[PDB]
Amino acid sequence: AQYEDGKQYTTLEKPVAGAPQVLEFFSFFCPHCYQFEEVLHISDNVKKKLPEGVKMTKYHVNFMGGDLGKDLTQAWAVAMALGVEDKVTVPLFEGVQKTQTIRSASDIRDVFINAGIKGEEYDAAWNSFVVKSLVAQQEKAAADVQLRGVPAMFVNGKYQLNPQGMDTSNMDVFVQQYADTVKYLSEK
């Protein structure tokens, strides 16, 4: 057919109950993730094509970058709790991968400050139980799908995007194939 299991997507032999409708995993250490976000704008083009009523979720992962990797998962929980994802995503990606000026939890914090989040507000969030549970949620979602690489996207805890079964000659075409595939899977 046009969309084939094993080609543009795979099916989880072990489906995950109660999963978010569209769930994306990434790491700020992840070079393809930088491309996805900063160059391809995958998350955004997927949104543009999703049906009525389907929300997207994006989680950070621990398994890249060691200690700073875990700090970034906690900062992303802070970003989600404060709703400032669209203000820190670019400076966090460039800080880790472009300028390489993020080397510590303090440097991560600087990005939020520079983005206009008050220190007292950032510190309160960082240390909060609501952020701890949001860290736990990110960790659980990754564990539920046995996640060992990013970027990754899952639809309804049943399907996993398979971008390798796509052409990259033209960047624009790949992004839309990716987005169209997510829409197809959502409507399944």
Side-chain angles (χ1 to χ4, degrees):
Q2 291 291 345
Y3 295 102
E4 297 171 352
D5 196 310
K7 177 185 163 159
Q8 298 99 330
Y9 69 97
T10 54
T11 303
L12 297 186
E13 56 185 63
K14 250 260 192 65
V16 180
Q21 298 159 293
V22 182
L23 179 60
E24 193 183 338
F25 295 95
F26 78 108
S27 171
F28 284 114
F29 280 92
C30 163
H32 288 135
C33 301
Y34 189 108
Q35 295 298 318
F36 262 45
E37 178 61 20
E38 297 307 307
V39 175
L40 299 178
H41 311 280
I42 292 297
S43 291
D44 185 74
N45 279 274
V46 174
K47 320 226 191 247
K48 288 179 18 197
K49 271 174 171 180
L50 288 174
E52 225 172 346
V54 133
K55 64 174 293 177
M56 282 202 338
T57 308
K58 175 143 72 189
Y59 289 163
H60 198 270
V61 302
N62 286 343
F63 59 79
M64 304 184 73
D67 212 84
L68 203 54
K70 270 195 91 143
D71 277 328
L72 285 162
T73 299
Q74 188 160 351
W76 188 249
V78 175
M80 286 188 291
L82 300 178
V84 294
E85 298 97 326
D86 296 341
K87 300 188 179 179
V88 298
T89 296
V90 163
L92 287 174
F93 263 123
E94 302 194 337
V96 175
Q97 294 191 48
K98 185 185 176 180
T99 60
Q100 295 184 359
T101 48
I102 296 171
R103 309 163 190 115
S104 69
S106 185
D107 300 333
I108 296 175
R109 179 175 185 281
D110 286 345
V111 170
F112 284 72
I113 300 298
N114 185 58
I117 291 84
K118 304 169 176 203
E120 299 79 10
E121 182 186 8
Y122 180 90
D123 295 336
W126 177 271
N127 290 297
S128 76
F129 290 94
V130 162
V131 159
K132 299 193 193 304
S133 58
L134 235 36
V135 171
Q137 290 176 229
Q138 298 178 84
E139 288 181 27
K140 186 186 178 272
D144 289 345
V145 300
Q146 295 178 60
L147 189 68
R148 98 202 64 95
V150 287
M153 193 172 299
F154 298 83
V155 174
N156 294 314
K158 259 242 200 84
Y159 307 104
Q160 181 182 348
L161 273 285
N162 191 40
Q164 272 284 50
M166 305 179 188
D167 181 14
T168 63
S169 60
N170 182 293
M171 315 188 83
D172 296 327
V173 179
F174 162 74
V175 174
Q176 288 325 309
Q177 182 173 20
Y178 197 104
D180 287 347
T181 301
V182 178
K183 179 175 188 289
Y184 163 82
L185 289 171
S186 65
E187 289 157 8
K188 216 192 185 74

